[PDB]
């Protein structure tokens, strides 16, 4: 599924993203849109032999287990394929772990290079929510 | 599958350092976040912090400085220290995973002169 | 910090009948509230995660619901073995704080 900006900022909010933890909901939509451009099927192959997986690309090496991935550790305790759904539910229940760790979004190379340092408001701005 | 189990002294002194120890069996310590939660006698909980895997550590400001949660990867297990304890540290501390699925027993701790 | 507020504080009765607990939060905490059991001499048990989901291994007359600041805990049906007591615990903002608990008896 390919959420619509504003669709995908309902949804995150009403997944309790709207200031999870010090970061504001603006930063977690700007966060999907340049990881996956709004697609729960968007999938990655890394050098490293890990995927991102899901709307917020959660890596196979660290975060989700795909049964493929030398090295993994699974920390958000979840199969990869369960990040690959339109029901965003593992997602952000796995985004929510890795942000709970001190390096909070920097996990993210997309928000980092194109969210962080910008008005993520923006991203959520003329929405119904 | 993974089991917790809380270690160390259950009978501490006022002032001094109160040291347990959570060992992991069934799964790396680098494969998850890791807590410490105790129950004061009168069924008061509280989050006393988490260590999460890049190494970074989140304390309940209620400890004052006083904690310190720590990891060895290579014994598998993590630890609590916390430091001049009074009779108000008297409490059940459990060690548990952040997800909270996988708890230890739990090790009641005395303090007292 | 976030202040969690359950009631009522102590909860009477019979098997077969059903009882909701609530928990409230002095602040917004969104989505993030979840459920813990504990009984005497015993290590706190996860029953539900996040206001609403599901935990694998639980009896299915647990549910969860609420947002914001309200919340609840449904037991349809309960049994004897749910007798104890019950907490709620907060994981939107450090530190993360547990409510005063509702102790549930048989009446």
């Known amino acids: 599924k390919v959420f619509g900006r504003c669709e995908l900022a309902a949804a995150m909010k009403r997944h309790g993203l709207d200031n999870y933890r010090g970061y504001s909901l603006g930063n977690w939509v700007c966060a999907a849109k340049f990881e996956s451009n709004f697609n729960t099927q968007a999938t990655n192959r890394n050098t490293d032999g890990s995927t991102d997986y899901g709307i917020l690309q959660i890596n196979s090496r660290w975060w989700c287990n795909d049964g493929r991935t030398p090295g993994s550790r699974n920390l958000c305790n979840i199969p990869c394929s369960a990040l690959l759904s339109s029901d965003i539910t593992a997602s952000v229940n796995c985004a929510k772990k890795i942000v709970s760790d001190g390096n909070g979004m920097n996990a993210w190379v997309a928000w980092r290079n194109r969210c962080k340092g910008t008005d993520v408001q923006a991203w959520i701005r003329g929405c119904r929510l | 599958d993974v089991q917790l189990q809380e270690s160390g002294p259950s009978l501490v002194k006022p002032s001094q350092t109160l040291s347990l120890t959570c060992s992991v069996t069934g799964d790396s310590i680098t494969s998850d976040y890791w807590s410490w939660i105790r129950k004061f006698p009168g069924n008061r909980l509280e989050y006393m912090g988490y260590?999460?895997?890049?190494?970074?550590?989140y304390y309940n400001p209620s400890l004052k400085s006083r904690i310190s949660i720590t990891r060895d990867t290579s014994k598998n297990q993590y630890y609590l220290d916390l430091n001049s304890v009074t009779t108000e540290d008297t409490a059940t501390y459990y060690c548990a995973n952040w997800d909270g699925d996988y708890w230890g027993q739990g090790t009641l701790v005395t303090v007292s002169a | 910090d976030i202040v969690l507020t359950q009631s009522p504080a102590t909860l009477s009765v019979t098997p077969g009948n059903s009882v909701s607990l609530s928990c409230r939060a002095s602040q917004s905490i969104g989505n993030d509230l979840h459920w813990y059991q504990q009984k005497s001499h015993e290590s706190p048990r996860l029953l539900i995660k996040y206001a609403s989901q599901s935990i694998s291994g639980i009896p299915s007359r647990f549910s969860g619901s609420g947002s914001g600041t309200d919340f609840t805990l449904s037991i349809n049906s309960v049994e004897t073995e749910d007798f104890g007591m019950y907490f709620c615990?907060?994981?939107?903002?450090?530190?993360?704080?547990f409510g005063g608990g509702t102790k549930l008896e048989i009446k």
């Open positions: 615990q907060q994981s939107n903002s450090w530190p993360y704080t």
């Open positions: 260590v999460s895997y890049s190494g970074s550590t």
